[PDB]
């Protein structure tokens, strides 16, 4: 289903590589996701970066391979509760969803795509969107991040 890698406590000891994503929220809505800077210019030495647009909220994520692969078009969406967004079971915890707007077109039947739901923002299977003939989405979910656990 959705690839889920959970951030864990004590993972701050030695991250060799890390990546940065702008942050959008369920309350902020689809508009914020459109507003977020897509191209983050890497003029980096050990990381120095600049963004095409100024953005208030930033999440620092480890260079997990799916997150690292995205590069441009990478965004993180904050959800107060996991259950509403996740088609499957939830742990009643805040959810971080990493989405790639570059692959927003629905081509992957099993792929999950962030879309604007009537209630708010939801992750929907591609096949389901194809059944409703929705050719495009906000972003294609690449990874779901769960909080650190003691």
């Amino acid at each position: 289903r959705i690839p889920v890698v959970r951030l864990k406590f004590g993972e701050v000891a030695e991250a060799t590589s890390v990546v940065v994503l702008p942050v959008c929220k369920a309350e902020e809505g689809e508009k914020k996701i459109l507003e977020a800077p897509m191209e983050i210019i890497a003029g980096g030495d050990f990381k120095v970066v600049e963004a095409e647009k100024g953005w208030k909220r930033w999440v620092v994520l480890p260079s997990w391979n799916p997150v690292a692969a995205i590069g441009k078009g990478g965004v993180a969406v904050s959800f107060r509760d996991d259950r509403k967004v996740l088609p499957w079971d939830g742990k009643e915890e805040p959810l971080l969803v990493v989405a790639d707007r570059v692959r927003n077109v629905v081509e992957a039947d099993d792929g999950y795509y962030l879309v604007v739901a009537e209630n708010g923002l939801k992750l929907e299977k591609g096949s389901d969107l194809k059944a409703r003939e929705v050719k495009e989405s906000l972003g294609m979910v690449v990874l779901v991040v769960r909080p650190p656990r003691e």
Partner: protein, 416 residues
């Protein structure tokens, strides 16, 4: 956990209920945490608590409520101390929860009826004091030798206050010993009563290191004809408070309860015991008056003020009342407003608390009797205005200014 969290349980009329707030350690499910609270606070088949309802705190991340029932048999009849060790003894130290706070307790009628309740209560107190139609007033003496203290008491009572209060930190010290304070204060009272024709008193502090000393002080106050005494229930303890309350009923002495040190356990909003719980516990233990403090979170404050005065309070989460509480005709407790108040707030205080209250004030430009006068005038003006339908929340400025035209003392106060 499946022996403690039961989502489809309906509480019995005789169950004790408690409402807790908590934040579970990261990676701890809310339900598991709820079940644990019930287990830690009860045995852990008829001697165990049950968690019957868990819900998130709206607007707050990683924060939940849990509602737990406890069988009637788990509590000693008539004992606040037993109820508290059973409920708050060690659950707060439980490892899977980051923080825990107790918000409310529903005491079933069957348990309420095993407690004495206030020695006299609101209606009896008005009758004993012969004071009707208004809030009562008093103050604390700011500063002394026992005689000088007695002079200050005399002037304040003589000038128009109903009560004068001992500083909560003065029990007996090398600079002043209680026996002398009691004699000189009593004299001041007797002179003021004789000269004004009213009933006046002083909240003599009988808080003491031992129960025997507490009784000696209380007995002396009785011998001197003192209508009311004071005690610090949180510092002294519930065993001592309850003991004094029984004494007070037998001897006809009103009991005033100070709430010093409450901040230690109820100030932070994510840990400890909400004051409203302590307020209920006190109403069951004893005490005729209880400090509530001022408001000039008024919703939460008013919530407990009703809980300690009314016979029946319907649950209303917007006021911080989680459970419907039936007090089964046990008498209520007068709230005492205090701290940060002066004549400028008199309108508000009268409208907010109504008549069943005491207002304690902290100097006046022309000494203590003018002080007392200014407060007495301001209060009467506000009450009479309320009775005529004047809106004290808006007209209060004019009500005080008009009163100031007939009273130089009040005017001197309003000048500042």
């Amino acid at each position: 956990k499946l022996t403690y969290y039961t989502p489809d349980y309906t509480p019995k009329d005789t169950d004790l209920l408690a409402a807790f707030r908590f934040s579970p350690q990261p990676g701890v499910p809310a339900d598991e945490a709820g079940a644990a609270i019930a287990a830690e606070s009860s045995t852990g088949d008829r001697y165990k608590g049950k968690c019957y309802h868990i819900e998130p705190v709206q607007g707050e991340e990683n924060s939940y409520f849990a509602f737990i029932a406890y069988p009637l048999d788990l509590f000693e009849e008539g004992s606040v101390t037993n109820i508290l060790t059973s409920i708050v003894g060690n659950v707060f130290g439980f490892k899977a929860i980051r923080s825990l706070r107790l918000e409310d307790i529903r005491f079933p009628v069957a348990l309420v009826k095993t407690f004495q309740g206030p020695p006299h209560g609101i209606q009896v107190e008005r009758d004993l004091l012969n004071k009707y139609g208004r809030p009562m007033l008093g103050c604390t003496i700011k500063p002394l030798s026992a005689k000088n203290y007695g002079r200050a008491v005399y002037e304040c009572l003589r000038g128009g206050l109903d009560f004068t209060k001992d500083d909560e930190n003065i029990n007996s010290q090398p600079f002043q010993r209680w026996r002398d304070r009691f004699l000189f204060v009593a004299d001041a009272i007797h002179k003021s009563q004789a000269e004004t024709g009213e009933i006046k008193g002083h909240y003599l502090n009988v808080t003491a290191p031992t129960c025997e000393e507490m009784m000696k002080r209380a007995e002396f106050a009785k011998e001197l004809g003192m209508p009311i005494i004071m005690h610090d229930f949180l510092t002294a303890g519930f065993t001592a408070n309850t003991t004094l309350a029984k004494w007070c009923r037998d001897n006809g002495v009103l009991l005033h309860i100070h709430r010093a040190m409450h901040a230690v356990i109820d100030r932070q909003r994510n840990h400890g015991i909400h004051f409203r719980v302590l307020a209920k516990c006190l109403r069951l233990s004893g005490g005729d008056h209880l400090h509530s403090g001022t408001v000039v979170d008024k919703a939460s404050t008013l919530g407990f003020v009703d809980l300690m005065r009314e016979d029946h309070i319907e649950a209303d989460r917007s006021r911080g009342v989680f459970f419907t509480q039936d007090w089964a005709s046990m008498p209520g407790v007068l709230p005492v407003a205090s701290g940060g108040i002066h004549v400028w707030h008199m309108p508000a205080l009268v409208e907010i608390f109504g008549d069943d209250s005491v207002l304690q004030f902290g100097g006046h430009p022309w000494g203590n009797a003018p002080g007392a006068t200014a407060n007495r005038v301001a209060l009467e003006a506000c009450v009479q205005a309320r009775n005529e339908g004047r809106d004290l929340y808006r007209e209060g400025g004019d009500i005080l200014r008009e009163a100031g035209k007939w009273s130089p003392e009040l005017a001197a106060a309003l000048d500042l």
